Amino acid sequence: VLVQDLLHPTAASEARKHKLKTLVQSPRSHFLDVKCPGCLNITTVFSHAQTAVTCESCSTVLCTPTGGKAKLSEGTSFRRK
């Protein structure tokens, strides 16, 4: 289509394409720090956690991995960092 800049892609166009198909092959996955209702400190959980996860000392389920992402149990607060 005459000219399209395949080096400066727009923020929406890149989003439209998946993961690897973009000019820079980077994960869409942002893995999170969690604040569970029991513990008092942050712990790292992956967005697509694969297996069962425990918080710190007590065996408390944080995320149930079904399909793509992880089903975060009950309702916890989280950031991208």
């Binding site: 000219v3 800049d5 080096l7």
Partner: protein, 129 residues
């Protein structure tokens, strides 16, 4: 599997030319392809090539003039001797004198005329025009 990366790149370029599109995306790229592109630029067949040669393998984007007609390959890279170069030119290049047969020689990757000047033939890598 993709066997010859350079070949694929050239095909892509050709397709772009056919379309009238003035940009490409060479997928695996690197080294040989880059040198080929440089050679082309030397005579001004492609406008300007820029690669996101990242931390993986490399991806070339070619902002091209569109003046290029066709750019071949031949992946059975035949060992060209100093005499049958003429024959090759006759076969591959359209005009008697316009166009460049790309040779990977011991002296480096360059066009046919340049190779002749250095008096070193090598192996055929491709051609433009």
């Amino acid at each position: 599997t993709r066997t010859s990366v350079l070949a694929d790149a050239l095909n892509a370029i050709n397709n772009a030319e056919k379309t009238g599109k003035r940009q490409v995306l060479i997928r695996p790229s690197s080294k040989v392809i880059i040198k080929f592109l440089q050679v082309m630029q030397k005579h001004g067949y492609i406008g300007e090539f820029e690669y996101i040669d990242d931390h993986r393998s490399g991806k070339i984007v070619v902002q091209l003039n569109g003046r290029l007609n066709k750019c071949g390959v031949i992946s059975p890279r035949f060992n060209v001797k100093i005499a049958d170069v003429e024959k090759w030119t006759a076969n591959l290049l359209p005009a008697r004198q316009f166009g460049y047969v790309i040779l990977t020689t011991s002296a480096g990757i360059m066009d046919h005329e340049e190779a002749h000047r250095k008096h070193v033939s090598g192996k055929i890598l491709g051609f433009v025009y």
